[PDB]
From Swiss-Prot, chain A:
UniProt induction comment: By HCFC1 C-terminal chain, independently of HCFC1 N-terminal chain. Transiently induced by TGF-beta and during the cell cycle.
Function per UniProt: Protein-lysine N-methyltransferase that monomethylates both histones and non-histone proteins. Specifically monomethylates 'Lys-20' of histone H4 (H4K20me1). H4K20me1 is enriched during mitosis and represents a specific tag for epigenetic transcriptional repression. Mainly functions in euchromatin regions, thereby playing a central role in the silencing of euchromatic genes. Required for cell proliferation, probably by contributing to the maintenance of proper higher-order structure of DNA during mitosis. Involved in chromosome condensation and proper cytokinesis.
Domain remark from Swiss-Prot or TrEMBL: Although the SET domain contains the active site of enzymatic activity, both sequences upstream and downstream of the SET domain are required for methyltransferase activity.
Cellular compartment(s): Nucleus; Chromosome
Residue ranges occupied by any SET domain in the UniProt entry: 14-135
Record note on what altering D136 to A/N does: Abolishes histone H4 binding and methyltransferase activity
Portion held of the full protein: 244 to 393 of 393
Protein species of origin: Homo sapiens
Subunit structure: Interacts with L3MBTL1.
Family to which this protein belongs: Belongs to the class V-like SAM-binding methyltransferase superfamily. Histone-lysine methyltransferase family. PR/SET subfamily.
Protein's name in the database: N-lysine methyltransferase KMT5A
Binding site for S-adenosyl-L-methionine: K24, G25, R26, Y69, N96, H97
From Swiss-Prot, chain B:
PTM description: Ubiquitinated and degraded by the DCX(DTL) complex.
Protein species of origin: Homo sapiens (Human)
Domain SET: 25-146
Stated family: Belongs to the class V-like SAM-binding methyltransferase superfamily. Histone-lysine methyltransferase family. PR/SET subfamily.
UniProt free text on domains: Although the SET domain contains the active site of enzymatic activity, both sequences upstream and downstream of the SET domain are required for methyltransferase activity.
Protein name: N-lysine methyltransferase KMT5A
UniProt-annotated binding residues for S-adenosyl-L-methionine: K35, G36, R37, Y80, N107, H108
Induction context: By HCFC1 C-terminal chain, independently of HCFC1 N-terminal chain. Transiently induced by TGF-beta and during the cell cycle.
Length: 150, 161
């Protein structure tokens, strides 16, 4: 917990660089080794609580156009979304998809505050592109974005 | 003979009817390698013919911070929104929501066979696609997505062609 919380809180985002990757646009490359289980980066965006039926139905219907930049989770009895659609200097939102990626999402708690983070699912070598499973997407998203299959 | 004014008034009413009826004939959806879904012509279109409306939620943008927020979302959502100025106003056609409409499924090319045009009905601007050259049945419809941010070009380098 201790060292991970400071990494989250400072927003240091060390050990990573942005590159332009053929077929993907921008992506994030590791510039240091990460060990299995290490914190890599926060999936940092605007935390939205989804409580309105209009918003809920709109987000569902926007899955192909915007769903690559929104990550849904439940925390306690509420449905949340980290909306990363806005350009910032944060790196989590530039990480590309793979079903067999070297990172995986986890909910991390800081005195109850929910943070969606990426942890290393295996040892990662310097020079590897960071990737994680974007998760559930609609049929239309899979037709729009067939790279979601792998 | 009907005069130019009557003939031009009549031609406007034809585009009006196509927009308002929302028929979208002569087009089908295909899955296209490297692009996802795209729209294919199933009939010939002639240069200048109405192809389809870019149909979505028309939003007047009235605030500089909102224009800035749209710019900041251009890589993530900008392919499915079309921003334009019309007289004193700025608008965005927000086509992010999945619907049965085809205009929003048309892919990009800088040298595409369609082009955008504004068409005013009762003071409301409609954004339409017309054919920029004769189009054969079997061709993918394509148009220029237009001005995009630098970040968008990095996210979407196919925007350059
Ligand atoms: C408005 S949509 C068009 C329909 C889209 N292909 C779909 O399946 O939803 C915009 C998206 O289409 C894709 N796209 C459009 N033109 C493209 C092109 N020339 N090359 C590669 N991908 C393209 C990109 O994924 C883009 O963000
Ligand atoms: C959250 S972003 C990641 C950063 C993105 N590449 C960019 O430059 O903004 C999501 C978008 O990245 C691209 N992408 C992500 N994973 C991909 C993959 N495995 N293959 C191809 N494109 C991918 C798609 O354009 C997707 O809609």
């Amino acid at each position: 917990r201790k060292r991970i919380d400071e990494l989250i809180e400072s927003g240091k985002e060390e050990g990573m660089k942005i590159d332009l990757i053929d077929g993907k646009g921008r992506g994030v490359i590791a510039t240091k080794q990460f060990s299995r289980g290490d914190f890599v980066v926060e999936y940092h965006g605007d935390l939205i609580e989804i409580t309105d039926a209009k918003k809920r139905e709109a987000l569902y219907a926007q899955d192909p156009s915007t769903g690559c930049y929104m990550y849904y989770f439940q925390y306690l009895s509420k449905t949340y979304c980290v909306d990363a659609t806005r350009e910032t200097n944060r790196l989590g939102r530039l990480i590309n998809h793979s079903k067999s990626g070297n990172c995986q999402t986890k909910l991390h708690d800081i005195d109850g505050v929910p943070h969606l983070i990426l942890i290393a699912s295996r040892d990662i070598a310097a020079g590897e592109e960071l990737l994680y499973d974007y998760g559930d997407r609609s049929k239309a998203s899979i037709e729009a974005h067939p790279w979601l299959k792998h």
